[PDB]
Amino acid sequence: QPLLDAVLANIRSPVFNHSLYRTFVPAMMAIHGPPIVSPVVCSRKRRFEEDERQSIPNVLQGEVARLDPKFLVNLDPSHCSNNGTVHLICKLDDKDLPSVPPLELSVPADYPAQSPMWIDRQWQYDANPFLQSVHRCMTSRLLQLPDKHSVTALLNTWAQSIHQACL
Amino acid sequence: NMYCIDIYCRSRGVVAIRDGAYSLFDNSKLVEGFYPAPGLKTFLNMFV
Amino acid sequence: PHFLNTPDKSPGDRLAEICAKITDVDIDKVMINLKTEEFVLDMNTLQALQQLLQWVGDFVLYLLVSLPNQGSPLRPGHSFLRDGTSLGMLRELMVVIRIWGLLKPSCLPVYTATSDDSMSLLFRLLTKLWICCRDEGAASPASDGLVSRLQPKQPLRLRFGRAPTLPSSTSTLQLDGLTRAPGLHLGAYPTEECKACTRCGCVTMLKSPNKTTAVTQWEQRWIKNCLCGGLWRRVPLSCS
Amino acid sequence: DFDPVQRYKMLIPQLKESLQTLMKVAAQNLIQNTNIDNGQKSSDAPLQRFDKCLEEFYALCDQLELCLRLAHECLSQSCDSAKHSPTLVPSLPYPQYLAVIKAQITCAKDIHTALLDCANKVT
Secondary structure (H helix, E strand, O other): OOOHHHHHHHHOOOOOOOOOHHHHHHHHHHOOOOOOOOOOOOOOOOOOOHHHHHHHHOHHHHOOOOOOOOEEEEEEOOOOOOOOOOOOOOOOOOOOOOOOOOOOOOOOOOOOOOOOOOOOOHHHOOOOOOHHHHHHHHHHHHHHOOOOOOHHEEEEEHHHHHHHHOO | OOEEEEEEEEEOOOOOEEEEOOOOOOOOOOOOOOOOOOOOHHHHHOOO | OOOOOOOOOOOOHHHHHHOOOOOOOOOOHHHHHHHHOOOOOOOOOOOOOHHHHHHHHHHHHHHHOOOOOOOOOOOOOOOOOOOHHHHHHHHHHHHHHHHHHHHHOOOOOOOOOOOOOOHHHHHHHHHHHHOOOOOOOOOHHHHHHHHOOOOOOOOOOOOOOOOOOOOOOOOOOOOOOOOOOOOOOOOOOOOOOOOOOOOOOOOOOOOOOOOOOOOHHHHHHHOOOOEEOOOOOOOOOOOO | OOOOHHHHHHHHHHHHHHHHHHHHHHHHHHHHHHHOOOOOOOOOOOOOOOOOHHHHHHHHHHHHHHHHHHHHHHHHHHOOOOOOOOOOOOOOOOOOOHHHHHHHHHHHHHHHHHHHHHHHHOO
């Protein structure tokens, strides 16, 4: 019903938003008397210094912290520092049979991709027939993985293919 | 429902009292309601 | 200097100066004692109402209510009111704005209520202390009783244009190379600035364009340094 | 002799219409202030006090609030009386009812003192 104040606020185009002060605050401070509605001091520096500057994007850090201790990830030659951010050089040190460490180079944390790249595979897989079967199984599983993810999905599929294709 | 008063504390210990039937202008009119003139409340409080 | 009067026997400056030697009270009589015609200068006189009239009214009203505050936590309290000459200038201002209200209805209200104008008794008590504050005179007790009580026309929250302190001689300084930690004359002091708000030396911090139409006298007057206002800063519009 | 429901029913439309009138006069004062300050003087007419409007609005609001609170208190009193005493009044002998109320008060005071001594022994 009181659209008059609405059309008046619409009229309030000029920059001098101080006439409303003299218009309203006299009666407001008269009938309401909280001159200090917040006498608590408020002086904090918003941005002094806050940055990691000493590691990779911590997203993959928090991800890899969840994985099973049977996966041992290390650091490769420095080519995945910030943008690529991942050189998944992992060892499956556990009670199961060991194998060749995967590469699994994923992309920036935006994740418009996954990890499996398999650079050093060309000679690591075709040499051993059993490892060749392992690679075949791992490829067939990865192709059936809809939009696999950085560390969890890739490493899980790799381990399950390695310990399923034993036969 | 008669002879309203209004006390309120703002500062570290300052609590002001006023008669709530004046409407910030006593000589003009009244609040059309509760009866005004609680009496000599000023000196009653100034006792202490 | 706004006296754009018709040619008369004397100048408006010396006439307004001698206006101090006037009757005791009832400025409505003083105006007819001196003159009332040759004071209009513009139909669009609506420049001091939103900017200066409320300002001078608040100043004089604080000067009024300061009298009962004799026992303040200060030997001179908040101010002195022992000059009279400045009060004479204030009386010239109030009588000329009375003439303005007679000409332009955009006069200076009492700003609260009950104008029953109301500046009459105000000017009366100012002159009552004037005869106590013209020259070689002491301050009076009847005026005390006259000013003590307050009407339904007494607001508060005056600007009191001043500068923030810097008492770091050898005592204390809470600052760094950057990151100032937060803790006006023509009005334009909102809760948070939303314009240019050109920072200045002490208190001004006025807007740069000011959205003016004919008040250019003030802007063209404060382009250079100001009184304690050579410290024209560029404090950002970090509104909060 | 007016009733709380009756006073509420007669105050609500007065409250609504006073709100409408105060909002209208506030809008009028605002447009007048803007025209005199932002633009040229066009509203050559005296406005209203604008203080009495919201002042009496808050006054009627306080009146309504306190009378509704009194009615709520009366209903709560009736409920607690019916719960703590049977509905009998001139039927029940008045001195016997006074003695029963006194004994109820004494029993409650005894229970409170027992719990207080219990808390003190816990200390």
